[PDB]
Amino acid sequence: MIQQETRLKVADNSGAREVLTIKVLGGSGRKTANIGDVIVCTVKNATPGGVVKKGDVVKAVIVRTKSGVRRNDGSYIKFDENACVIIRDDKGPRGTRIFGPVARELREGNFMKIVSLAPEVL
Amino acid sequence: MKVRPSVKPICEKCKVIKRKGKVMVICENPKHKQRQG
Amino acid sequence: SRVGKKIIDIPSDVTVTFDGNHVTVKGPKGELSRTLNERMTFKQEENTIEVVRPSDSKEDRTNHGTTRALLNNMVQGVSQGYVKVLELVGVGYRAQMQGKDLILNVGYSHPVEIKAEENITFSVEKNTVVKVEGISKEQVGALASNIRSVRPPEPYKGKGIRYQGEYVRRKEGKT
Amino acid sequence: TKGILGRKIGMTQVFGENGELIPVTVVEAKENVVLQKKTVEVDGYNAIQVGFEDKKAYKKDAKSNKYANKPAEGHAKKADAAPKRFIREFRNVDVDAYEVGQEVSVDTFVAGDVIDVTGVSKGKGFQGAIKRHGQSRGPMSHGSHFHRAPGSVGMASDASRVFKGQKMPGRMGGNTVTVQNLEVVQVDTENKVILVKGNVPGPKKGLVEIRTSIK
RNA sequence: AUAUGUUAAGUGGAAAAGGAUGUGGCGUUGCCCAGACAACUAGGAUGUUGGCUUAGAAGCAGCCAUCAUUUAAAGAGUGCG
RNA sequence: UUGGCACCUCGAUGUCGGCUCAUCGCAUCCUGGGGCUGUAGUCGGUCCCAAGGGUUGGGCUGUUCGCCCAUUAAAGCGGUACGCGAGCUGGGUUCAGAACGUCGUGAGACAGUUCGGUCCCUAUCCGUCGUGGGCGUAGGAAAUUUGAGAGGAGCUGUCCUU
RNA sequence: GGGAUAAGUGCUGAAAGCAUCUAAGCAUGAAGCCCCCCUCAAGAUGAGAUUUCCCAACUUCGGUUAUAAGAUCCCUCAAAG
Ligand SMILES: [Mg+2]
Ligand SMILES: [Mg+2]
Ligand SMILES: [Mg+2]
Ligand SMILES: [Mg+2]
Ligand SMILES: [Mg+2]
Ligand SMILES: [Mg+2]
Ligand SMILES: [Mg+2]
Ligand SMILES: [Mg+2]
Ligand SMILES: [Mg+2]
Ligand SMILES: [Mg+2]
């Protein structure tokens, strides 16, 4: 469950350290998001340098919610923080050094570049 | 189809007819299709 | 009604048989039957039919001249048979018979099946010319207007199911 | 075709092909018999009626429902049968099958049939507008005294009445409702159960009506 | 209810500029068994586009100049172009 | 809509917005079907048919409005005492305090600002949401049903193949 | 998914020798309309239908006495309130 005005850690070296969501894109009236959902968001704490800077409005994909996802075999997965990877409007990222574990459930959302730049996917 | 109270021939080849209670004009170019309304 | 004074409607070996209110026309390709009218009366004096209107009113003058055309078009497709020819234009439009029913390929994602009915034979000449043949002018006009509701002609190139001598109004629209 | 009566035992889960967990409602569709065959020549419509759970016979000083009465003896005697607690008609079935007295067993369905399950709801009692209907409640602070009331019930004096269909409070209620396009996943013939995929309306030991999908 | 009409819209049982005919009634009028009005198809001309000829334009940028007759009969082309 | 008129109400017809709950028109915002195009396609434009359903979340302003950030298939326009306060708030404003500007000799005033400023009601009838009792249904019962009718539903994106 | 249609699209076809979607006909045509789907429904006073059960005498039969099938009071309860 990630809605408007949730602070998320940014899980790569795209230039951002914290980001808050404006809208959950998708359909009209869409309230929450989970792993694999793209959100549009403004960075609040930014690294000095990098690419993005404080006050940019970026699109970004959800990796590793704290209220994680359910799988077809009745399995679950949950994480200790909400994280996020800033993408570059072709489902490809801005950085090359994605941090932290990524949920498996975005392999099927054509985020294969985010998977290959990541640590162990679970 | 141009609906208008004032249906008229626009060129000389356009003809004026009544279909189902309404005054229409028929012509070879389809820009002169009119029905009155 | 000058189509009603010329109410001769000259027959042939086709033998027109009245039935009182309506008329059946039989011949070499026969058995058409049509409930015509009540006011228009009928007389076969020696060999031809005749359609006579009373009272000279507007309803009796409209409905009389149609009733001559309803005798005459029954007795002439049973005499000869009505044919309306329709044509494909386009790069890769191939009509062909599936036996009794006709199958089009007009640029869709699917073939279009025009299922036949009685008194109608579909014949394709060279995959681009289709003939509809039959004995009644309304039934071979109705099915010769469903073949081109599949794909009507188009102004910018001409592609689509045409009639035989149709003048397709064309435009010159370039990028 | 293929109607049957049962009762809700409860709810479990089952694993399937490639280990997929699928939720499951166990329905004990036991001892159903065909109890009266109805014909258009007598009634106007073709149906059978199935009696579900047999109860004890006629007793003279019976004070409760588990002993049948004399109209229910003689009705379930015209078929060679025991008197049943629940009796329902099924008119989607073919009337030319189902001889009267047939024990319509649990293996009329195969794993993978689409079905409709008809049952009553739970029944919640007298409930208010934001629970009986999905109404937005008022603000809980900022001075307000409107929380769980219904809102306005009309317009002022054009329509000087309240229109019907107003969605006011009252009994949430156990009323009949169908869930459509459920699957049968597993038919245990010896236990006489059906595992239907998902949840069906009603409380436990209720009554269901598993018949095949009209869609 | 009689008698004679009218209207076909439920007009009756709410409008206007205008738009059309839809039928009534009353005229005036010019056409015609020397055969009209359709429609039938059949000659469609020619010097010649002649001139200003006009991007060449030869029914047509625009000035028309638009005379004779291949002719029973059509135009220095009615006109679609 | 701004008005005009002064007909109802001054032994009271009580409040602008917002909230909750809506409902109705169609002069249609999206989706449906068409005509025309100065419509190649992709897009459009314009007109016609149509109310079935749908028609976002924030920032600023008390604001209606408006601007703006995001979206969305679309973020329709109106009517219902500018719908709805014996359903709610009371920010806006006609109360007493105080202050500025301005005006007045003054007490004061502005319809200029600014800070603060008590929201009563146990539902009789109608109407609505549930629920029982009585009687009728030409014998009395138990059980299953017919459906005259009424109500609910009804939206739509994206992607892949062609 | 069916019917019937809107705007539209036609076929045949006169009136009006032609032409003409209309006048007589014949089609086709939408998230709309009617079904289809889901509920609720014989207080549907038109009160429906099927199946099963029950069958009285006293007695100006006025009524009473009892009762049938069936219920209910009461009592134990909740899947119901
Ligand atoms: Mg005009
Ligand atoms: Mg709320
Ligand atoms: Mg009120
Ligand atoms: Mg009227
Ligand atoms: Mg006065
Ligand atoms: Mg409209
Ligand atoms: Mg009031
Ligand atoms: Mg003061
Ligand atoms: Mg002073
Ligand atoms: Mg204070």
Is C163 inside any structural domain? yes
Residues C59 and C93 both lie in one domain = no
Range of the domain at C54: 17-81
d(CA A58, CA D148): 40
DSSP E strands in chain A: the ranges are 7-9, 16-24, 38-46, 57-63, 83-86
Distance from CA of B7 to the nearest CA of C (A): 24
Q: Provide the domain count of chain C.
A: 2
Whether B7 CB is under 7 Å from strand E: yes
Query: Is the Cβ–Cβ distance between C65 and C1 less than 8 Å?
Result: yes
Residues C127 and C56 both lie in one domain = no
For residue C113, the tally of other CB atoms under 10 A from its CB is: 11
d(CA C169, CA A113): 54
CATH no., domain A1-122: 2.40.150.20
B14 annotated as ligand-binding? yes
Range of the domain at D210: 1-215
Which 8-state DSSP code applies to residue C77?
H
- A73 and D21: CB-CB below 8 Å? yes
Residues C76 and C104 both lie in one domain = no
Determination approach: cryo-EM
d(CA D167, CA D133): 7
Nearest to A103 by CA among A74, A83, A73: A83
Cα end-to-end span (Å), chain B: 11
Residues C89 and C76 both lie in one domain = no
Please state, in angstroms and as integers, the Cα–Cα distance from residue A48 to each residue in A13, A45, A53, A59, following that order. Answer: 11, 9, 8, 20
CA of C93 to the centre of ligand 9 (A): 98
d(CA C91, CA C76): 38
Residues C57 and C29 both lie in one domain = yes
Query: Is the Cβ–Cβ distance between D23 and D47 less than 8 Å?
Result: no
Q: Please name the nucleotide lying closest to D51, CA to C1'.
A: F144
For residue C38, give the CATH number of its domain: 3.90.930.12
d(CA A34, CA C43): 87
Q: List CB contacts (< 8 A) between A74 and chain D.
A: 13, 15, 20-21
Residues C105 and C66 both lie in one domain = no
Query: Is the Cβ–Cβ distance between D22 and D90 less than 8 Å?
Result: no
Distance from chain centroid for Cα A117: 14
Burial class (CB in 10 A: 0-12, 13-18, 19+), B3: exposed
DSSP E strands in A38-90: the ranges are 38-46, 57-63, 83-86
Q: What angle do CA D123, D49, D190 make, to 5 degrees?
A: 80
Residue type, C9: D
Tell me phi and psi for residue B31, to 5 degrees: -75, -10
Instruction: Please provide the size of chain C in residues.
Output: 175
Strand F footprint nucleotides (protein C-beta < 7 Å)? 19-23, 34-40, 47-49, 55-58, 69-75, 79-85, 87-90, 126-131, 141-147, 151-152, 157, 162
Kindly tell me whether chain D and chain A come into contact, counting contact as 3+ Cβ pairs under 8 Å.
Answer: yes
Is C12 inside any structural domain? no
CA atoms within 13 A on the CB side of A24: 18
Q: Which residues contact C76 (CB under 8 A, 6 or more apart)?
A: none
Nearest to D192 by CA among D166, D210, D169: D210
Query: What sign does the CA torsion over D180, D185, D189, D193 have?
Result: negative
Residues C123 and C145 both lie in one domain = yes
Strand G footprint nucleotides (protein C-beta < 7 Å)? 7-18, 20-28, 36-40, 49-54, 69-74, 79-81
Residues C43 and C88 both lie in one domain = no
For residue B14, the tally of other CB atoms under 10 A from its CB is: 17
Residues, CB within 5 angstroms of ligand 2 (ion): D 136
Query: Is the Cβ–Cβ distance between C85 and C164 less than 8 Å?
Result: yes
Residues C92 and C139 both lie in one domain = yes
Compute the count of residue pairs across chains A and D with CB atoms less than 8 Å apart.
Answer: 12
Instruction: Please provide the size of chain B in residues.
Output: 37
Resolution in A: 2.9
CA of D111 to the centre of ligand 1 (A): 71
Residues C111 and C69 both lie in one domain = no
Residues C88 and C165 both lie in one domain = yes
Cα end-to-end span (Å), chain A: 19
d(CA C124, CA C40): 41
Is C137 inside any structural domain? yes
Distance from chain centroid for Cα D62: 28
Burial class (CB in 10 A: 0-12, 13-18, 19+), D151: exposed
Q: Please name the nucleotide lying closest to B13, CA to C1'.
A: E80
Distance C139 CA to G14 C1' (A): 19
CA of C82 to the centre of ligand 1 (A): 44
Residues C106 and C67 both lie in one domain = no
Q: Provide the domain count of chain D.
A: 1
- Residues after which chain A is broken (C–N above 2.5 A) are none
Query: Is the Cβ–Cβ distance between A46 and A54 less than 8 Å?
Result: yes
d(CA D60, CA D67): 9
Query: Is the Cβ–Cβ distance between D87 and D46 less than 8 Å?
Result: no
Instruction: Please provide the size of chain D in residues.
Output: 215
Distance C148 CA to G9 C1' (A): 12
Distance from chain centroid for Cα D72: 22
Q: List CB contacts (< 8 A) between B28 and chain C.
A: 169
CA of B5 to the centre of ligand 6 (A): 17
